[PDB]
Amino acid sequence: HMVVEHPEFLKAGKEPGLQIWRVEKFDLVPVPTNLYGDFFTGDAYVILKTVQLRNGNLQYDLHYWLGNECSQDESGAAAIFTVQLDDYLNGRAVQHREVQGFESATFLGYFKSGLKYKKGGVASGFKHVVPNEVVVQRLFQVKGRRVVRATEVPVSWESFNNGDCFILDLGNNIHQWCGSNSNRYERLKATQVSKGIRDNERSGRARVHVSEEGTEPEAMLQVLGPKPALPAGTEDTAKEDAANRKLAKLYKVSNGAGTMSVSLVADENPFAQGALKSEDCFILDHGKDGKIFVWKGKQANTEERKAALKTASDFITKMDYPKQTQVSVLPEGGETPLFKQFFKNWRDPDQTDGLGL
Amino acid sequence: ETTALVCDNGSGLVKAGFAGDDAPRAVFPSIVGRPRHQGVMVGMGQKDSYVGDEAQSKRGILTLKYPIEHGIITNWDDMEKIWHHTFYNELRVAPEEHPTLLTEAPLNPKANREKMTQIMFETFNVPAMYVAIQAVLSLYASGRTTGIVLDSGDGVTHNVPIYEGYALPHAIMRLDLAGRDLTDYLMKILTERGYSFVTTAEREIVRDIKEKLCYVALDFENEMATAASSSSLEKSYELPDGQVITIGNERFRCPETLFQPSFIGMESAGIHETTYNSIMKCDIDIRKDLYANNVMSGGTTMYPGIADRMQKEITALAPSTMKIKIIAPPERKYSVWIGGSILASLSTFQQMWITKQEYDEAGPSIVHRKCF
Amino acid sequence: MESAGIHETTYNSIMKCDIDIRKDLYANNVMSGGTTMYPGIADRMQKEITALAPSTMKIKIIAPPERKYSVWIGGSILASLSTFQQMWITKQEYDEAGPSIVHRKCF
Amino acid sequence: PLNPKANREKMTQIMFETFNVPAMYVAIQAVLSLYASGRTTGIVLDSGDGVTHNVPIYEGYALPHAIMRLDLAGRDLTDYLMKILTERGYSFVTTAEREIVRDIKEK
Amino acid sequence: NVPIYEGYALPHAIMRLDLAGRDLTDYLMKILTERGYSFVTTAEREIVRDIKEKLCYVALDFENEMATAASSSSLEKSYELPDGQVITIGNERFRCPETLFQPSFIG
Ligand SMILES: Nc1ncnc2c1ncn2[C@@H]1O[C@H](COP(=O)(O)OP(=O)(O)OP(=O)(O)O)[C@@H](O)[C@H]1O
Ligand SMILES: [Ca+2]
Ligand SMILES: [Ca+2]
């Protein structure tokens, strides 16, 4: 029976009379006096009548009125504000449920003129979400000889080559396409990125499919179109290992020096996992295809995190990245596996060492 | 400025998301898996403990343990793993910014409340926290302030009478059978057809058979007669090995364990007359509304025909001088989360949070005086 | 020999596994070794497994052209992985534990 | 797989005592073949000259109860071909003739 | 496992655990390969069943029995196969009854 201290209840039940309240997005607003006796059919309302007795005490009576077209949040808000207004009172009030069209005879008796209903009302405070939805249509090319990396490529048959490997992401189905001229390391990297994007981004609510030439499923052919003649593939040299080496820039933001500081950690992947200090906040900028990652520490101050987001938003306009660049905010222990590929031997805390028990 | 989090910790299905939403963002089963064979493919991201729907995906090569049994938290380290997977992997947010709202079972022991407070405030370092009850939040989800709630999830079945927006602690009662025991009953009554399910890996397959193909018979004996005589209700299911099983009279015998507990041997009452037993324990003058608001909640109210059979069984044994209605919204399996979303998003909920500095000069005892 | 063929050996190898993992194991049949270098063995394997398995399943068989040396190629991978350096049986472990160290370390 | 233990102790003993290597590891052939393909899930039918074995591995975890081994490989195929070549009157008895029958089996 | 009360069974409490002497024979068929003895077909399954009947015992405690089997050789005993060859069995005499208490030995 813990009492609330919302300031609008201070003018409630102090003189004998009748008071009406309307819900608008999880909050109460008192309707004006000449709008008494009539209600919107798509809104919910709270009704108080407080009546003086002969012996001195002041009785109360609550009702909460529901329309036939009101949303769920308005009705639940009317119920909980009825309960909270009774709880602010010293338990001397009684509550009543009122339904549009099916009101009680005592409810008709309060309003002298009668009840008249108009269409419409205030919009609901809820926003429409589904449980467990993904709408994703991406394509990743994984490529390399020693330093293998992933790069986002646009969804077409022309982007395919025989010398690399490809990951087609279609929500609940993830397809792994291996080239005939593809080698061992990018096949292993494609499998590792596939199991990462299943078990971390989608948390196992996906199915990973592996295919090669001639065994393409109906999903790949339906999304991508008929298969043309593939324009071969270049043999894996050492120059693209250096090109993959120059793809990411790890930066630091910290207020440990008592002032603002954006500093270069590194410009050479594979980075060290120990370089990510827990008291500071870091930025990885793989913005050639439009990705920037803001890694937040657990022991980082709020102004560091806001400054990291501000600086990451500045990096679209400074280096002229294209206008599909996503700013992904990553806390500790919940990293995207596209962020994990730039680090030397990423270690989750509950990993298995050796064969295991 | 920041948004609150709602996390309904179910006994076999945990829901989570942000405040102010019309549906929970993540629904996933509260299962902690551990490997049962040796990993010979070394270096390829093998983990000592798979948690959540990731454990459900590779469920063959794991042993699965439920951290909550019968609505009560028992294994705490796995429950912390459920929380770590919920905050960091599912919702993809840091707990330090967002206030968190939790749901508890009715008649929870107070030590569990204190330990829930301690692992929320110490391990994850939340800025605000609050605990609330399943059934009254389902009643706020129904848009009512007075009524009975039959909350029948995966662990237990709870019957909660609520008057003036508060429960009546003498009259909440517990009946310990739910969909886990129905899954074990269906596991028992598929052996006569020659299909064997003995381990925890294929228990979710039997659960999926229960979810896809079950219905409540309005009358049981004639449904026996038509099932024995004809075969119009016999239907097939496709196992993920590709074998096709066929189900006859066992489609609707499995809901009937709720009405007849002697199918699985315990001496307790069925689900229909325990609500009568709860409502006789209440005061007389309230009952005129208390029968009228029959709020059904939980995922084991998803069966077709549970409402008509409930109406018939209450109307048989209640006195005939009073009208009975049964209400069952389509979102009552998520209604605890919907109540948490509306309560966390209120204009009066900012003073009812338990902040960090209030926890510091009170310890893990301020949760009793404020969540009340 | 009254033992059955390699297709039924593959089939009851799949059947001895538990029920949840048959789907992925049908679609990832891998052959290796020089004895799998006959022409047309993949089509006969596909027909026999397609006969033995239920008809709703898709069965895919992977027969790379470098499968003669695949054991060595995977050996070069496994020797080249960074994780593997804390599973080498060193000299001093053999000297302290005898030849029986290999069953506690390997497999 | 499913070789005797004494092979592993004697292999450890001649590698560590005679040649004096600084490290050793021994691995299953079919695990190494699945390393070659780049997959993690699958059943590998590895068939050498002496051993034909089925190994299923789901994710990273092998299933040792489902390991099948059959002693039917290229040696027995070579010997059976040497048996059935006598139906046309061609006789092959010596070991160099067994190598020639191995060449005609390959070709 | 069948409870019976007043001379009648209780069908709700009868349970069927599906491993018996066939699976014990198959596990002993598995755990005789490491001593170099090979049994594959159904003809010699009866011989392994006879070895299981003549020489097995349930250990009262498992780990000290394994320790004494590893240290000493007082429990190692021989069997005479009907081809005249003599096998010897050591710690596998008691490991094969333990599958009833530990089904994870056969997965
Ligand atoms: N359509 C369906 N048909 C049958 N059973 C269903 C259906 N949907 C869900 N269930 C069952 O409902 C249960 C989950 O419901 P719910 O999420 O309300 O439970 P919970 O919150 O985990 O449980 P508890 O309230 O005991 O903590 C499971 O036993 C599940 O098998
Ligand atoms: Ca409205
Ligand atoms: Ca009151």
Ligand SMILES: [Ca+2]
């Ligand atoms: Ca390439």
Ligand SMILES: [Ca+2]
């Ligand atoms: Ca800092």
Ligand SMILES: [Ca+2]
């Ligand atoms: Ca619940």
Ligand SMILES: [Ca+2]
């Ligand atoms: Ca070989």
